[PDB]
Structure formats: C-alpha cells, structure tokens
Amino acid sequence: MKEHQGAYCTGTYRNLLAEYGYGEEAIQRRLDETWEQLFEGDEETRIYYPSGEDMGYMLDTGNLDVRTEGMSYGMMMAVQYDRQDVFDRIWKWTVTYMYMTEGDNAGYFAWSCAPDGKRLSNGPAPDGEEYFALALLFASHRWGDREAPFNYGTQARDLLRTCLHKGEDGPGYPMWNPDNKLIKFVPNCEFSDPSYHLPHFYELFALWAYPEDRAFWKEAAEASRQYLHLACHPVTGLAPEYAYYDGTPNNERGYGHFFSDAYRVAANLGLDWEWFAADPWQREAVGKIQAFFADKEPEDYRRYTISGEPFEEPALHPVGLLATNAMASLAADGPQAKACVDLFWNTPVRTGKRRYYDNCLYLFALLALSGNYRIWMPR
Template sequence: MEMIASGAYYTGQYRNLFQEIGYTEQQINARIEQTWSDLFDGAEDVRIYYPLGDDMGYMLDTGNLDVRTEGMSYGMMMAVQMNKKDVFDRLWKFSKTYMQHTEGRYKDYFAWHCKPDGTRLSQGPAPDGEEFYAMALLFASNRWGDGPAPFDYANQARIILRACLHQGEQGEGDPMWDASTKLIKFIPESPFSDPSYHLPHFYELFALYADEQDRPFWQEAAAASRAYLHTACHPETGLSPEYANYDGTPAPVQRHGDFRHFFSDAYRTAANIAIDWEWFRRDEWQVGQSNRLQRFFRNIDVADYRRYQIDGTPFEELSLHPIGLLATNAAASLAANGPDAEHFVRLFWDTPLRSGERRYYDNCLYFFTLLALSGNYRIY
C-alpha cells in the first residue's frame, strides 16, 4: 500500500525536478516569477493576459484573437497557484459576466469562446473549461476564503459541478459526464470523449467538496478516467487521439474534422497523467505510460514535432504548438522513471517561452509545466 499513500495529497511533499538536476531554489523561483511577469504583464508578442476596465481581465487566444473558457480557467488556476488574487478575481468576473449562461439548456455552463469585449461567438460549452473553473474556484476558497457573490468561490464551484452532472434532469440540456460510463464528454451532446479532458486528480478532490450526494460519483469518475486512459493511450507509443470513444478507440471523423490522431488537444494527456501520479499515486501504469511517451519523442527534434497517428506514423503536417508539446513531454517526467526523464526536464529548462502569433496554447502548457516540475502545482 505504500505506493498508494505516497502522493503529495497524502504527504504534502511535492517533487522539485529542477532542484534534483542541480538548479537552486533561487534560480527556480526567479524563473517562475519572470515567466509569470512575461505572460501577464510582458511584451506584446509574449503576454497572453490583458486587464479590462477596473475589475476584469481576459486570457487572449492570440492565434484566433478570441477568449476561451480553456484559457480563462487556466489563467485562474495559474493565479491561485501563484497567490495572485487580483488577477484571479478579474478573470472570474469576466467569465461570470460574459460567458456563464443564466438560463436555458446551458444554464450554469460557459459559452466556450467570445470576443475580448465579451460578445459571445458560440453559446455551447467545452467541458475542459468547466472542470478547470471548478477546481480553481475550490482552491481559491481553500487558499483565500470566500467573499460575497460572485466571489463565494466554493459555492460557485458547486453550482458548476451540479450542472455538469445533473443538467437536463429537470428540463432541457445534457450533463457533461456520461452517466453510465462516468466519463467526461467532448461536449454535452456528444457520444464520445476527449482523452485530454480526463483529470482524475481533480475528481478525487471534487469527491471531497462537491454536493454530498454527488461525492460517490466523483470517486467513481476518478477510477473510470484512470482506466479509460489505459485504453485511449497506445500501448507502444503512449500517444492518445484527440477524440476517443468511451471504449478508448479513436472517435469517428467529425463534421469539423478528423481527430483520430495525436495533435494539439492530445498533448495535455501526458501532463494530466503525470500530475495525477504526483498528487495521488493510485495507478502504477502511469509510470510506464510516461516512459513510453518520452521514449517515442526522445530522438525527435522539437522543430520536427508534427501530427502523428497514435501508432507513431508521422504526417507531413508539423505541430502548430511544438513548445506546448515539449512542455507536456517534460511534465511526464513527474511520473516517468526511465532514461529520458532528466533529458526532457533539462530540454524544457533550456527552452524559452514562445513568442508571436501562436503563443497562447504553448505558453499555457509551458507555465503549468514550470509550476509542476518545480513542485509548485499544488493542492489547496
């Protein structure tokens, strides 16, 4: 049982992989502070956060010039990890004001993208935003305490989680989790999932803080997601598809494209698995999986990262987000114990933030990896 009880949730101890390879605490902390400063207050071709008025702000998807629940909820998680309450509250107020539905089939869900002025571009939600919003809000409640609405963080998190499981029971709409498999959906209406949405380490914590009657579901969802990732990740390469059916097989081609392959969304799967291992250590498979993925990428130059079939067959198409992929390959070192783990930590440390038009997604993944590998992506 030692393995099961040795995660950071039980011990309060978080590995600092940068320190393990020889960097000092001072160097590491300076790097984190500088990176935060670059992303939230830096040069125009690097920053991804912009304040709006006196009390709001947004994370800009610089490739599409829109604001997405993915980035907004990521920004809130970054802010609570960094103890930046002002930024957190600004992002949350924007999300609450412009993105969260107050009625109809999507009540309490968030429109997945809008313009920087808050005008909605789509009404539908994307569940990866909702789960990050809920977790960031619970951490904020535990770190800073609750204030008056909408800064009653724990209550706001429970409203979101309630909708995720129960939408449609009293009328129109659909839940974000499939009731029979306990797996998160790609969108509420879809009959398939997205492996990179699976965050069993979050569900373990939702099982502590959600409405009491839903806590057993979240415990089951954590176990179901861990098992699902075994089937969604290729047994030799460790690569997972963008979208996958509930049995883990790649989902059929969609009207908006072919997502049976390893591409941008799928990068996150490696980091999610590694952080679940760091926090809870409930699934020994995660170690071998992380080793497999790093072995696949070890001899591929970052500039040559591309789209792959999950068996590793490369496409002509280069990755749109090579720095993001490097970041998640490095995050896998939290779980990996193979010969490539240190290589990816060093390579990541030696790689700067991405600048330019496509920087948003890469730099979100970059900052989470910087926090995770330094032992600063923590449970509050």
C-alpha cells in the same frame, strides 16, 4: 520517497528541477520571470490582458478570441501563484460575458467569446468547467469566499452540480455520462477527449462537491484512470485528440490523431501520479511517450497517428508539446525523463501569434516541475 507517495496524503511536493540539479535560486527566478512575461509583460509573450478596474481576460492570440479553456487556465495559474487580483479579474469577465442564463446549456459557460465580450458560441467546453471548479475550490481554500460572484466555493459546487445533473428536470445534457462515469467532449455528444480526463481533479471533487455527488466523483476518478489505458496506444503511449468510450480514435473531423489537445495527456498523468500515485500504469505510459519523443527534434514535430506515423503537417504548438513531455517526468525516472526536463529548461517562452496555447502549457509545466502546482486544502 515522495516519488511514490501522493502529495494529497502527505501535503509535500517534489521540486523535480531541484532534484535534477538545477539551482533552487535559478528555479525561483525562472518561475517569476515566466509569470511576469505572461501576466505583466508586453506584446512579446503576454497571454493575459486587464480590462477596466475589475476585469481581465486570457487571449487566444492565434484565434483572436477568449475561451473558457484559457480563462480557466488563467484562474488555475493565478491561484497556484497566489495572485487573487488576477484571479478575480478573470473570473469577473467570465461570469459577466460567458456564463449562460438561457438555452439548452444554461448553467454552463459559453466556450468562445470575442475580446469585447460578445458571444461566439452557445455551448460549453467541459475541460474549462472542470478547471473553473477546481480553481474556485482552491481559491476558496487559499483566500476564503467573498461576496457573489466571488463566493468561490459556492460557485464551484453549483457548477459541479450542473455538470452532473443537467437534463434531469429540463431540456439539456450533463457533462459526465451517468453510466460509464466518463467526462464527454461536449454535453450533447457521447464520445470523449482523452486530455479532458483529470482523475486527480475528480478525487478532490469527491471530497468537496455537494455531498450527494461525492460517490459519483470517486467512481469518475477510477473510471477515468482505467479509460486512459484504452485511449493511449500500447506501444507509443500516444492518445488521440478525440476518442470513443472504448478508447478508439474518433476521426470524424480530423481529431483522431496525436495533436494539440492530446499533448495534455502526458502532463495529466504526471500530475495525477505526483498528487495521488494511484495507478502504476501511468509510469509505463509516460515512459512510452518520452521514448517516442526521445529521437525527435522539436523544430520538426509533426502531427502523428497514435501508432506514431508522421504526417507532413508540423505541430502547431511544439513548445506546448515539449512542456507537457517535461511535466510528465513527475511520473518517470531515468535518463529520458531528465532529458525531457533539460530540453524544457532550455526552451524560452513562445512569442508570436501562436504563443497562447504553448505558453499556458509552459507555465503549468514550470509550476508542476518546481513543486508549485499544489492541492490547496481547506483551512
């Protein structure tokens, strides 16, 4: 029954792995062992590093920098897994070194910093901001606001207000286009990134943002669901990394194809379907993506055009790709959905220098597929 009802309305979540016949005990051990390898382990698989007695960061092992993407992912993992200490350490590093107080992007977070905290950029990444906002709202709901900067719900609503209203009475740009209600790739650009579209997040912003903005967020939820119809290829289901507002790929700088960023689209559709069960098209799109990857070996994943033509270049993050295709099974049924999940179940967390993006997607999938990626409601 829960396959067809949004978890938002019921407060109950599918444990897809248990449904599929993996043991409840083994599922719990896999999740806990994965947490420990990523947040309490060593040079083998770790993506989180404590620093001092009140801070910590998520390290892009491949680019040797700290990004808002990973920091916001870390906060979302920490609030889903109920570790406020890790959450607060990450958020503290973020406010101290990444929050921007001047320039055109004041009120946003610099997307890239060095592990020492020195700025590598003066612009934000909207996917980090929207994860920061929802993680903080969840943290406010699970644990309660504390004193600034750990006044989580206030930080989230203030952030979300900036995302919509910047540039109204200043020299900057908002992160959502006010006309088509679509999130942008960056504030200063009039195109988008399909994997940034989180209609399930905007449904929640439409309940918990400052009241005046809730109408906008509700239309952003519906606009983003419709937009993904344009961005996903009608045969393969594959979306480009960057795209214009009409869904056509933006290959200005090589981002017009199916590569690392776009892997998240399938996972987002799975999570939106589980949380809100709002657009039956999502099931058809996930069906197309899983069919495309059914005849493919992870060890040979490539860059592909959205129509499915392979490049010579192999996938940089094949474990991340198979994890997102597994998470998409929340919106799928049949043997290919079970096969995507079985591949993921039999795939260990990544090690080596390129493990950071793979391992973030891996933990997200495991949380979602075990019934542990939830909407944390106000108390």
